Amino acid sequence: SMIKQRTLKNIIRATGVGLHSGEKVYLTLKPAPVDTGIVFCRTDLDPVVEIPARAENVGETTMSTTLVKGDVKVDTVEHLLSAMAGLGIDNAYVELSASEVPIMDGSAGPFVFLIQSAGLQEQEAAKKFIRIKREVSVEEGDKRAVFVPFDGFKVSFEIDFDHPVFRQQASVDFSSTSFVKEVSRARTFGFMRDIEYLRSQNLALGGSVENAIVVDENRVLNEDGLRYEDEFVKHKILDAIGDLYLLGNSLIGEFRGFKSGHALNNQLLRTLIADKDAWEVVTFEDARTAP
Numbered sequence: 001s002m003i004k005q006r007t008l009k010n011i012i013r014a015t016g017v018g019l020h021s022g023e024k025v026y027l028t029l030k031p032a033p034v035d036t037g038i039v040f041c042r043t044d045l046d047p048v049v050e051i052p053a054r055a056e057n058v059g060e061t062t063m064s065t066t067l068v069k070g071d072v073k074v075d076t077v078e079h080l081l082s083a084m085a086g087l088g089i090d091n092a093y094v095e096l097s098a099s100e101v102p103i104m105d106g107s108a109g110p111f112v113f114l115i116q117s118a119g120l121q122e123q124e125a126a127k128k129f130i131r132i133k134r135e136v137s138v139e140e141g142d143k144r145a146v147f148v149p150f151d152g153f154k155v156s157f158e159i160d161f162d163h164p165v166f167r168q169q170a171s172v173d174f175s176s177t178s179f180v181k182e183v184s185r186a187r188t189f190g191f192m193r194d195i196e197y198l199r200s201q202n203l204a205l206g207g208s209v210e211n212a213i214v215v216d217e218n219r220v221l222n223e224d225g226l227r228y229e230d231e232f233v234k235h236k237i238l239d240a241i242g243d244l245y246l247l248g249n250s251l252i253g254e255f256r257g258f259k260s261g262h263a264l265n266n267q268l269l270r271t272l273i274a275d276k277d278a279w280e281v282v283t284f285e286d287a288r289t290a291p
């Protein structure tokens with residue numbers, strides 16, 4: 001039986017604050033027809049401005065992943081897009097009453113729960129996948145992000161913080177591992193060493209122990225502890241999954257990041273897209289060879 005596109009079964013609402021802007025924001029997820037993709041929509045503006053969640057619309061990547069259209073921004077899409085990718089949602093509208101997606105608890109957990117509580121709806125159209133046919137890598141200094149052919153979906157990531165809290169590598173093959181259980185609850189994180197500079201630039205205004213792992217010099221400040229023994233590298237993997245979903249289709253292949261971030265993730269997407277001989281679009285009317 002054919003693998004079909006999926007949208008949301010029902011409308012989903014959530015409230016929160018932007019990690020970086022600190023502004024209160026109302027979020028609304030709505031079903032969308034086949035071949036819509038994920039589309040963000042600023043409903044605080046008149047007319048409403050819609051920005052497709054696609055690599056070509058990525059603006060700055062200095063802190064989070066940001067979408068731009070003219071003068072209009074949608075900040076910090078990566079954790080919600082990761083939740084969307086992890087649940088295989090092809091088509092959806094994401095309405096926002098402000099320029100930044102709410103941070104929630106810092107992870108994708110709340111989004112995957114809200115989505116699954118509403119339910120998913122299968123649609124009468126073949127789901128399209130992007131299959132990696134040949135290796136594609138981008139580098140900058142010692143940082144590196146790579147796509148590798150792989151009959152499945154696998155994300156591996158390595159970070160290199162010289163910090164006592166870290167004393168940092170994980171590979172997740174999603175044919176054996178649940179995104180929901182092992183990745184989705186990984187919270188974003190930041191350092192007291194950086195926060196005075198960030199706040200002076202009006203960044204991370206909404207960040208606190210309520211929505212992030214806050215790492216001091218000599219300890220984590222959150223009194224409740226880590227959700228995963230390797231929560232930090234698992235959050236980087238979460239980030240990559242949402243960043244990679246800006247291809248606009250589920251990936252058949254492997255991502256490897258070494259000290260990568262949103263900027264290098266998007267550069268890898270742009271290199272992949274331009275190298276047409278490195279990938280092809282496939283559907284599964286007969287699912288017997290599907291990974």
Ligand SMILES: COc1ncc(COc2ccc(C3=CCN(CC[C@@](C)(C(=O)NO)S(C)(=O)=O)C(=O)C3)cc2)cc1Cl
Nearest residue numbers: 063064078188189190191192195204207208209212214239
């Ligand atoms: C005593 O006074 C204070 N006490 C506590 C605080 C709060 O402390 C912080 C410090 C940092 C953060 C951040 C949390 C999350 N992030 C995004 C991370 C990223 C990996 C990501 O997850 N992207 O999706 S990244 C680089 O790619 O954007 C940040 O940058 C900073 C939150 C609270 C403040 C004061 Cl003043």
Ligand SMILES: [Zn+2]
Nearest residue numbers: 078079188239
């Ligand atoms: Zn993140």
